[PDB]
Design a binder for this molecule. Structure first.
Ligand SMILES: C[C@]12C=CC(=O)C=C1CC[C@@H]1[C@@H]2C(=O)C[C@@]2(C)[C@H]1CC[C@]2(O)/C(O)=C/O
Length: 244
């Protein structure tokens, strides 16, 4: 039933509003992706608020969690869309904005694009189910926390365990087989941290020199990155890993 709720609140597809009549310069591609991000952010917040248990957390905890994990959430969903739509061959940012080889090249971030595509390829290798995907996604929202703790730790800890339990539910044949599956899926979750570190680095860099580099960011994103950046730079956040 918790999973049925996840399927119900899963956001609808978000379009980039991209104009293919324009040249695909790095400036336009990145500004276009950031505009898409702003629209996705709206969907993400509405989603977080509908998650059983999220509301129970303090308002500052809800805000902190979203700002620390939005990049992981969007990159993870990107991996899923790319998996279901292109079997991991292209990056399906949006129905109207699919990144092929040419776009990855002109984006100036080919390496990050391949890092994101690798997530999609892991979905392929593991044949991740929609249910596993949904549970894993919630876990990402709950896997980057303040080193000094949350105001609703008890509630947070409770919520996290419930969703981890839900994941094992989605996973469940043989017990050892289920254990192996949990091992593999959580390895994928842990792998998001290093990827996101690279995504955020380029995000903060272009954000800081937005005007100079002509890379536009919507206000929906500017507000969040403005506050998040110093917190991350100061090293206030830590990951909640599943493996050594
Ligand atoms: C959020 C986003 C776009 C929506 C989406 O489905 C997935 C992502 C993940 C990668 C993000 C990307 C954009 O936001 C543009 C970013 C943020 C890129 C990481 C580097 C980036 O290309 C950047 O820094 C351009 O300025």
């Amino acid at each position: 039933f918790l999973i049925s709720i996840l399927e119900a609140i899963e956001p609808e597809v978000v379009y980039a509003g991209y104009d293919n009549s324009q040249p695909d310069t790095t400036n336009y591609l990145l500004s276009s992706l950031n505009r898409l991000a702003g629209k996705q952010m709206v969907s993400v917040v509405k989603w977080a608020k509908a998650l059983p248990g999220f509301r129970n957390l303090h308002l500052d905890d809800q805000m902190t969690l979203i700002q620390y994990s939005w990049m992981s959430l969007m990159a993870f969903s990107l991996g899923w869309r790319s998996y279901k739509h292109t079997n991991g061959q292209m990056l399906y940012f949006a129905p109207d904005l699919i990144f092929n080889e040419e776009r990855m090249q002109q984006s100036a971030m080919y390496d990050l694009c391949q890092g994101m595509r690798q997530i999609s390829q892991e979905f392929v290798r593991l044949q991740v189910t929609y249910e596993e995907f949904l549970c894993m996604k919630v876990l990402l929202l709950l896997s980057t926390v303040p080193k000094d703790g949350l105001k609703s730790q008890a509630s947070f800890d409770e919520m996290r365990m419930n969703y981890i339990k839900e994941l094992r539910r989605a996973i469940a044949n043989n017990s050892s087989q289920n254990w192996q599956r949990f091992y593999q899926l959580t390895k994928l979750l842990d792998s998001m941290h290093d990827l996101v570190g690279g995504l955020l680095q380029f995000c903060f860099y272009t954000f800081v020199q937005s005007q100079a580099l002509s890379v536009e960011f919507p206000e929906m994103l500017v507000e969040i990155i403005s506050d998040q950046l110093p917190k991350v730079m100061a090293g206030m956040a830590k990951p909640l890993l599943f493996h050594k």
